Design a protein around this motif. Structure first.
Motif, PDB file in Angstrom:
ATOM      1  N   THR A 144       6.045   1.900   4.833  1.00  0.00           N
ATOM      2  CA  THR A 144       6.466   0.674   4.760  1.00  0.00           C
ATOM      3  C   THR A 144       7.624   0.638   5.116  1.00  0.00           C
ATOM      4  OG1 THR A 144       4.833   0.004   3.130  1.00  0.00           O
ATOM      5  CG2 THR A 144       6.786  -1.518   3.150  1.00  0.00           C
ATOM      6  N   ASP A 150       9.474   2.577   2.284  1.00  0.00           N
ATOM      7  CA  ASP A 150       9.688   4.150   2.595  1.00  0.00           C
ATOM      8  C   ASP A 150      11.002   4.258   3.151  1.00  0.00           C
ATOM      9  OD1 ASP A 150       7.173   5.792   1.653  1.00  0.00           O
ATOM     10  OD2 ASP A 150       6.434   3.824   2.615  1.00  0.00           O
ATOM     11  N   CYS A 171       8.813  -0.381  -2.940  1.00  0.00           N
ATOM     12  CA  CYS A 171       7.569  -0.192  -1.912  1.00  0.00           C
ATOM     13  C   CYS A 171       7.957   0.153  -0.459  1.00  0.00           C
ATOM     14  CB  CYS A 171       6.712  -1.523  -1.897  1.00  0.00           C
ATOM     15  SG  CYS A 171       5.973  -1.743  -3.489  1.00  0.00           S
ATOM     16  N   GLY A 190       0.859   4.100   2.840  1.00  0.00           N
ATOM     17  CA  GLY A 190       1.311   3.511   4.003  1.00  0.00           C
ATOM     18  C   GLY A 190       2.596   3.820   4.188  1.00  0.00           C
ATOM     19  N   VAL A 222       0.687  -1.356   0.093  1.00  0.00           N
ATOM     20  CA  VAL A 222      -0.076   0.057  -0.155  1.00  0.00           C
ATOM     21  C   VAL A 222       0.777   1.340   0.049  1.00  0.00           C
ATOM     22  CG1 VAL A 222      -1.862   1.204   1.154  1.00  0.00           C
ATOM     23  CG2 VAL A 222      -1.948  -1.043   1.092  1.00  0.00           C
ATOM     24  N   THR A 223       0.913   2.011  -1.023  1.00  0.00           N
ATOM     25  CA  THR A 223       1.777   3.398  -1.367  1.00  0.00           C
ATOM     26  C   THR A 223       1.509   4.273  -0.048  1.00  0.00           C
ATOM     27  OG1 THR A 223       1.761   2.504  -3.427  1.00  0.00           O
ATOM     28  CG2 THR A 223       2.792   4.852  -2.971  1.00  0.00           C
TER      29      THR A 223
HETATM   30 CA   LIG Z   1       3.823   1.975   1.696  1.00  0.00          CA
END
Ligand SMILES: [Ca+2]
Ligand SMILES: [Ca+2]
Length: 282
Positions: A177, A198, A196, A175, A172-173
């Motif tokens: 990660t 962060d 994906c 969020g 999920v971009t």
């Molecule tokens: Ca993410």
């Protein structure tokens, strides 16, 4: 305030470069911030929480009523907000139990937990998801929906030494990660990697609360342990910036992170390590 004798993951995040100082400094505590621990539960009586943890949701239905009979959720909660082992030492903690005594749970129960946090979280709020599994558009949608409602999500990258983009909710971009590092700033051997992510945070040999008693501790590893250091810092940021949207929080965490220090970060990974220091007017 400066904590002496700090455990290594806390020690690492308040500084840009090695060597470790043995200390964790914080200007904020997450007072006024609400942290939803979507996990195996929390042993809310643990000394680490000082009454600041409560159980609010349980999809397992085994009679624990949000209590943790695995350990993982308590350990994660302790990293977010424990007095000794936590980042945000006055944050309120809420058990959203979606995994059982073996750390397993239906996808439907996880979605129910996320959706409970969307509907019922007290703002400002952070949610921590130190869990995952196979790709699930339904779970991705539930997480996106909760982020769109104003709640910051910290998401573990996973522990397969694979590209995190294959997994939910890590992919999920919106969020934050989180991959795992070791005390030498290497990416942990098991950490997922790639575009994906962060950023990274301390994930190997992390000490926090456990479930054998109200003073117990354990030292374990995983992207599950990295994630709550990010959630904790998000709580620190939200105490000063309570109306900040998840996009603003994510940009503040990623923009403040230390660049270039993670070794063997893996293909297409952002080379960024969590950093907790935010300046303020004086
Ligand atoms: Ca993410
Ligand atoms: Ca330090």
């Amino acid at each position: 305030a400066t904590q002496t004798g700090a455990t290594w993951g806390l020690d690492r995040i308040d500084q840009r470069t090695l060597p470790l100082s043995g200390t964790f400094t914080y200007s904020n505590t997450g007072s006024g911030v609400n942290a939803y621990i979507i996990d195996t539960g929390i042993r809310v009586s643990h000394s680490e929480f000082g009454g600041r943890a409560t159980a609010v949701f349980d999809a397992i239905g085994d009679g624990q009523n949000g209590n943790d009979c695995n350990g993982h959720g308590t350990h994660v909660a302790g990293t977010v907000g424990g007095t000794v082992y936590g980042v945000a030492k006055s944050v309120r903690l809420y058990a959203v139990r979606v995994l059982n005594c073996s750390g397993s749970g239906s996808n439907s129960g996880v979605i129910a937990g996320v959706d409970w946090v969307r509907q019922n979280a007290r703002r400002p709020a952070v949610a921590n998801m130190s869990l995952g599994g196979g790709a699930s558009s339904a779970l991705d949608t539930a997480v996106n929906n909760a982020i769109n409602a104003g709640i910051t999500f910290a998401l573990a990258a996973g522990n397969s030494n694979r590209d995190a983009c294959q997994f939910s909710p890590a992919r999920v971009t919106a969020g934050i990660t989180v991959g795992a590092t070791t005390s030498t700033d290497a990416r942990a051997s098991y950490s997922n990697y790639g575009s994906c992510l962060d950023l990274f945070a301390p994930g190997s040999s992390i000490t926090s609360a456990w479930i054998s008693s109200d003073t117990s501790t354990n030292t374990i590893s995983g992207t599950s342990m990295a994630t709550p250091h990010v959630a904790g810092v998000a709580a620190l940021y939200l105490q000063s910036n309570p109306s900040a949207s998840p996009a603003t929080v994510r940009n503040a965490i990623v923009g403040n992170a230390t660049s270039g220090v993670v070794s063997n970060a893996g293909r297409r990974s952002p080379n960024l390590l969590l950093y907790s220091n935010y300046e303020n007017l004086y």
